Amino acid sequence: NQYYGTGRRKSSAARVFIKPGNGKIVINQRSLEQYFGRETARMVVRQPLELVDMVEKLDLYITVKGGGISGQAGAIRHGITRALMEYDESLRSELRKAGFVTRDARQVERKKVGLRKARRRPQFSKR
Amino acid sequence: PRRRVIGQRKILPDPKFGSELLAKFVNILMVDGKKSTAESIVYSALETLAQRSGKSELEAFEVALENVRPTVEVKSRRVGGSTYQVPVEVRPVRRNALAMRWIVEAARKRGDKSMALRLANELSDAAENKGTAVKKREDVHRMAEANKAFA
Amino acid sequence: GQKVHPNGIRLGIVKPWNSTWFANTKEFADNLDSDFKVRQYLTKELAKASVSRIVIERPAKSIRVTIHTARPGIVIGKKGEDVEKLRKVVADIAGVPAQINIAEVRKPELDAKLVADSITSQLERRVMFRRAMKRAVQNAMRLGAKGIKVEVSGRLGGAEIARTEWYREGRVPLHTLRADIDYNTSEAHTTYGVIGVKVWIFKGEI
Amino acid sequence: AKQSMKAREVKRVALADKYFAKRAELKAIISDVNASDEDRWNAVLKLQTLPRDSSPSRQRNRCRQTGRPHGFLRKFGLSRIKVREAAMRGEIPGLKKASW
Amino acid sequence: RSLKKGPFIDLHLLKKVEKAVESGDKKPLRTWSRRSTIFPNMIGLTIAVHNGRQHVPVFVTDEMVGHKLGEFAPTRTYR
Amino acid sequence: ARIAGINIPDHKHAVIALTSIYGVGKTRSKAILAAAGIAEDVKISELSEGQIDTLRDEVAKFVVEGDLRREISMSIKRLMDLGCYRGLRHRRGLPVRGQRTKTNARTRKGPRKP
Amino acid sequence: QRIRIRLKAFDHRLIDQATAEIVETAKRTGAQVRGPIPLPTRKERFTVLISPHVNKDARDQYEIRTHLRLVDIVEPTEKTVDALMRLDLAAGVDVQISL
RNA sequence: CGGUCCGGCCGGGAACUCAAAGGAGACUGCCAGUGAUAAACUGGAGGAAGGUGGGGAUGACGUCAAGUCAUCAUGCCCUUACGACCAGGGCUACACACGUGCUACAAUGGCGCAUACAAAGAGAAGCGACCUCGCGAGAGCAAGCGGACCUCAUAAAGUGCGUCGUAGUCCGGAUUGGAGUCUGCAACUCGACUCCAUGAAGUCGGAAUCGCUAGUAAUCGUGGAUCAGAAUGCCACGGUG
């Protein structure tokens, strides 16, 4: 049966459904290679089911909204970790030690008044 | 850090080779947050710097780093009213950081066509113990040997 | 340093709005201007009625005004003729039919607006400012206020160089948002210019 | 603002309601239509015989309380200073200090 | 750079020009309409265009048609 | 080779080589190569002389050469002799199109002089 | 047919009270109620200079939150229609009735 | 799960994303060690989060006779004028000096074609789709939308292929000529934008000096206020990092 997990990052939210047994990954009706042309984005998605030996042992059906390439890849990684813990729950320690169960709460800092950016302050002249 | 003791951030391994050294090299070579642009450069340079020698890639990169890695550097000091230069021993992490930064600034100061070619040539020169990165390492070691009296 | 307005910082936390209607962008400015004109007329007409707060809310196609006053019999008058006259012109100002309610301020010595008005009236009567300030502080503190501070500024007693003086009793935690701080100001128009009076009244937390 | 500036704004609003509501809309319609009388519609000359203050582009948004011509806000019809004064007194519904 | 739906000219200046050409050679035309376009029927007349303080005499030639009147009356003094 | 526009274009991609003519930019170069029938990515070498005669026949349709310089000089001279505002701005080497002269007029004013 | 009610307010407690009143009016009338569905909040924002002269770096940021609720009744008995068309709700709540 | 024009589109489903109201959660709470058996500090477990988790609002008594009498209010002078109305001009000048920015000097790039992934907003004298005409700015016609519905609105860096091959260049775009569009009574002084043409300086910047400690700097687009029109400024938003 399906084991579900929700992953999130900067602005992305991935819905990950895992099923027992094959090497298939479908992100938004696209393959992993089709969806992520960046190799870091594929390495991040495949990352959690490498500590746990799953080559063709789990089928992933993923949809993801918002964010960019890296945010969506991190959201998919988070969702896959959550679905794997829902699937076994003994993999908790490994995915903890790897750092995948942690939700990366690093959001874009807002622009502040009098500053050119979140922290970038305008050029200061003394004399 | 007046009082701040600070930890370490998680650098991800290289997608192609799985090395933290190569990840930090890509980070140092990256500009304007263009990591995909820097990774292509590093991968092309490592490929071109692979057929030349014969020791795969990672090995060639480490061989190039071994010749640019500085053992001792000078730290400016203002005690006796003038420029004191105390030669301090460099830590291994700072050793690798300095080596990589020097290799990148030496490759960017080249006349070859693309940054991949400049990197490949700089790394091949470093493996041959020549170039401007090895030149800077010998400069630093020279400046340390000159001020050895101030250790 | 400059301090935040203690009333505006607590709006929605522990302080309610004085205008409680809803409107889109089309009618927002019109309702704001009409509320301003209504409040201006009511403050000018009821100057001697100890009016402390004018709450204005606009139901579907009308306006109803609640006047918080410590002298309700003066606002209402014999057979409500005065409040009827007030309503008949509030309806003209607002354009829509009007309704007026009178809410009593049971303890005027604990309302910052009424205290500031009393102090400015005394200042205009050439009363010594220190005496007025201390009388206000004592009257508020003996009536169960948790704290009060009043502050007057600008040519006190006819001085050529302006000065700011403030008296404080009890506890006035302006940084606690949970704190019920009643704050209002007033200006005394004297022969030597304007004297601004500010009053903070602390009535407990939550 | 001076009293004459507010009187000017009032007169301009009145003139813009009187003429440009219908007459100048008609004239500009005759001027912009390509299908009509490409030679002597005469609308261009008649548009300038109307008063200038009747043009809505000559109106300047001023604070409804002070008449300030800068820092205006169409949502409230007030300048920034009077907007802040009314906001802190709790006289603008729903408006409060923002943080995020 | 005005649209191609016809050039602009102030009506009072237009009637002044017609009255000047129909009545034969006349005095310089005093006008403040620096924004009016020079039309071919103004060739030969000298229009005194206001520049802020004075009315600068401008003798119109065939080469000026299409310009605005204010293009021949500088408003700023610089030496 | 050489064109009816005396000028001699370099031996490189035809679309960019035709730009060397005064009066022919990128758009007009593409239009010339399209109306002639020559590809844009072919060099000036590898072009037959019959194909260069074709390019000349097409560039003859444009006023692009010392002729164009003459028409530009005539317009600026007309402006200056007319004495209009733009004529005066051309006479004094000051910006003509409303740019500020308090600062930043260095293209028209040239290197600054104390 | 069916009636949907769009409620707008600046205070969320007030709009929740109004929505509760509406759903009680409808359910106690014997109609079916779909909702109340919390629609997204439109929060306008304003940044004004707090100084009378210069001091641009000194500003206050204000905002107005508009809360939205949607109430649907699928089969509106005449009872329900003329019951809700005479409901008494708070002043600071804007009610729309779409048919 | 059925149907399907393969479009959540239509039956439906209420799971999930999300919307927005209520609640839980973090307290040095637990473990070990150090410490005056104190306060605390160091590490560990667990946990989404760990030590005021990140950011914001919040600015004590006072200092600078600091800024504002030109937002406003307020205690000498003018009054057939220092008040009021109008048209035109100026605030846009230009030998020069400074502050703050934008664009560059390029190959980690320019151009061409193809294609992927946002968030936050605004809209009725308003946003304006589809279609037709125009090289384009735009125009004509005319839906929908007071809006999780409609429109603004195609995100761009990125990625794939091709080309350019280190040159004042297929870098750079200043300046100027011609032809136009739109707003507006009216684009001369003195608007923005489009097309064609032209193609300054600039090849990384002396003395000196600035910002920034993590989703930060750097870089890439997006929106809003003011506003008929006029953003390289301001205020906000997300992407890579």
- Which positions in strand H are less than 7 Å from the protein's CB atoms? 15-22, 46-49, 53-63, 65, 67-68, 71-75, 83-101, 107-109, 116-119, 121-125, 139-140, 146-148, 155-160, 163-166, 170, 174-178, 180-193, 195-200, 209-219, 225-228, 234-241
B16 → closest Cβ in A38, A39, A44: A39
Residues in B touching A99 (Cβ below 8 Å): 10
Same domain, residue pair C81 and C133 = no
Lookup: tokens for C198:
């500010």
Answer yes or no: do C64 and C138 share one domain: no
* Dihedral pair phi/psi, residue C148, rounded to 5°: -160, 140
Q: Is residue C11 part of a domain?
A: no
DSSP string, chain A: --EEEEEE-SS-EEEEEEEES-S-EEETTEEHHHH--SHHHHHHHHSHHHHTT-SSSEEEEEEEESS-HHHHHHHHHHHHHHHHHHHTSSTHHHHHHHT-SS-----PPPP-TTSSSSS-PPPP---
Q: Which residues of F touch E72 (CB under 8 A)?
A: 82-85
CA to C1' distance (Å), from G17 to H33: 56
Q: Decide if D10 is inside a domain.
A: yes
C23 contacts on D by Cβ (under 8 Å): 93
CA distance G70 to G88: 18
**Domain co-membership, C75 together with C153:** no
Could you check: is the Cβ of residue F46 within 7 Å of any atom of nucleic acid strand H?
A: no
Residues C164, C128, single domain; the answer is yes
For strand H, list residues 38-97 of chain A whose Cβ lies within 7 Å of it. Answer: 38, 40, 65-72, 92-93, 96
**Token duo for residue A95:** 């995915």
Q: Which two tokens stand for residue C116?
A: 């500031």
Q: Indicate which CATH number applies to the domain containing C132.
A: 3.30.1140.32
**Secondary structure of residue D54 in the 3-state scheme:** coil
Spatial CA neighbour of G27 closest among G82, G76, G69: G76
Any idea what the CATH number is for the domain that residue C26 is in? 3.30.300.20
E18 at D interface, C-beta within 8 A:
no
Residue in C with minimal Cα distance to G65: C22
Which residue places its CA closest to the C1' of nucleotide H47? A102
Q: From the Cβ of D24, is strand H under 7 Å away? A: yes
Residue of E nearest to D36 (CA): E5
Instruction: Please tell me the total count of domains within chain D.
Output: 1
Is there a single domain that holds both residue C176 and residue C190? Answer: yes
Q: A25 φ, ψ to 5°?
A: -130, 125
Residue G53 sits at the chain D interface (C-beta within 8 Å): no
* Same domain as C111, residue C206: yes
B10 CB contact with strand H at below 7 Å? no
CA distance F71 to E71: 22
Residue C70 and residue C27 share a domain: yes
Distance from CA of E79 to the nearest CA of D (A): 36
User: For chain C, what is the domain count?
Assistant: 2
* Domain range enclosing D28: 1-90
Considering the domain boundaries, does residue C7 fall inside one?
Answer: no
Q: Is residue C125 part of a domain?
A: yes
Of F50, F45, F90, F52, whose CA–CA distance to F72 is shortest? Answer: F90
- Which chain G positions have a beta carbon within 8 Å of A114's beta carbon? 56-57, 59
Q: Is residue D40 part of a domain?
A: yes
Broken C–N links (> 2.5 Å) in chain B, after residues: none
Experimental method used, please?
Answer: cryo-EM
Give CA separation, B132 vs B24, B128, B137, C122, G70, in Å: 21, 12, 9, 86, 71
Q: Which residues, at least 6 apart from D17, have a Cβ–Cβ distance to it below 8 Å?
A: none
C194/E25 Cα distance (integer angstroms): 70
Contact at CB, E67 and F78, closer than 8 angstroms: no
Contact (CB<8Å) G64/D84: no
> Would you call A40 and B10 a contact, using CB atoms and an 8 Å cutoff?
no
Residue at which a domain ends, from C78, C106, C134: C106
Question: Would residue C4 count as lying in a domain?
Answer: no
> Which of C106, C125, C160 finishes a domain?
C106
Strand partners, G45: G63
DSSP letter (8 states) at residue E36: P
Q: Do E71 and F84 touch (CB under 8 A)?
A: yes
Q: Other CB atoms closer than 10 Å to residue G46's CB: what's the count?
A: 20
- The tokens for A114 are 């009098």
Is C150 a domain residue?
yes
Whether A118 CB is under 7 Å from strand H: yes
| 3-class secondary-structure state, position B97 | helix
Between chain A and chain G, the number of residue pairs with CB atoms below 8 A apart is 7
- Burial of G44 per CB tally in 10 Å (0-12, 13-18, 19+): middle
Q: Within 7 Å: CB of D89 and strand H?
A: no
The answer to whether strand H lies under 7 Å from the CB of residue F21 is: yes
Q: Kindly state the DSSP code that residue D86 receives in the 8-state scheme.
A: H
Q: G52: which nucleotide lies closest, measuring CA to C1'?
A: H68
Whether C134 is covered by a domain: the verdict is yes
Residues C116 and C206 placed together within one structural domain of the fold: yes
CA distances in angstroms from D87 to C8, C82, C179, listed in the order given:
7, 31, 20
**C-alpha–C-alpha distance, residues D97 and D82, integer Å:** 15
Between the CA of A102 and the C1' of H40, what is the distance in angstroms? 30
Is residue D46 one of the residues assigned to a domain? yes
Q: Cβ of B15 and A99 within 8 Å?
A: no
Asked whether strand H has any atom less than 7 Å from the CB of A1, the reply is: no
- C-alpha closest to that of D47 among D28, D32, D29, D34: D28
Q: Is residue C8 part of a domain?
A: no
Q: Structural domain of residue C20, as residue ranges?
A: 16-106
Q: Give domain status of residue D37, yes or no.
A: yes
G7 vs G29: CA distance, rounded Å: 20
Burial of A21 (0-12, 13-18, 19+ CB in 10 A): exposed
Closest CA to C206 of C170, C165, C173, C169: C173
My answer on whether C122 and C164 are in the same domain is yes
> Three-class SS of residue C120?
helix
Using CB atoms, list chains with 3+ pairs below 8 Å to chain D: C, E, G
First to last CA, chain E: 31
Q: Verify if strand H has an atom below 7 Å from the CB of F83.
A: no
CA of A44, closest CA in chain B: separation in Å? 9
Provide CB contacts within 8 A for C141, sequence distance 6+: C147, C148, C169, C170
Closest to F38 measured CA to CA, from F13, F9, F8, F6: F13
Tell me how far apart the alpha carbons of residues D53 and D58 are, in angstroms, rounded to a whole number: 6
Q: How far, in Å, is the CA of F95 from the C1' of nucleotide H184?
A: 26
Is the same domain home to C95 and C115? no
Chains that touch C (3 or more CB pairs under 8 A): D, G
Q: How many CA atoms lie within 13 A of D83 on its CB side?
A: 30
Same domain, C32 and C123: no
Tokens at B65, concatenated: 């780093």
If one counts every other C-beta atom within 10 angstroms of the C-beta of residue A83, the result is: 26
Inspect the structure and tell me whether chains B and C have 3 or more CB pairs less than 8 Å apart: no
Residues 6 or more apart whose Cβ sits within 8 Å of residue G55: G49
Q: Considering only alpha carbons, which residue of chain E is nearest residue D49? A: E11
Domain boundary among the residues C64, C81, C106 is at C106
Assess whether the previous peptide bond of D51 is cis (omega < 30° from 0): no
Q: Determine the Cα angle at G38 with ends G32 and G41, to 5°.
A: 150
- Is D touching C (3+ C-beta pairs, cut-off 8 A)? yes
**Chain C residues with CB within 8 Å of chain G CB:** 12, 20-23, 57-59, 64
Cα gap C108→C69, rounded to integer Å: 9
Q: Which of G50, G63, G66 sits opposite D96 (nearest CB)?
A: G63
Task: Examine residue C50 and state whether it is found in any structural domain, yes or no.
Answer: yes
Q: Is residue D76 part of a domain?
A: yes
Report if residue D84 sits inside a domain. yes
Task: Answer yes or no: is D35 within a domain.
Answer: yes
Both tokens of residue D26? Answer: 């008609």
User: How far is Cα of residue D96 from the mean position of the Cα atoms in its chain?
Assistant: 28
- Tell me the nt nearest to D27, Cα to C1': H185
Asked whether residue E16's C-beta has any atom of DNA/RNA strand H within 7 A, the reply is: no
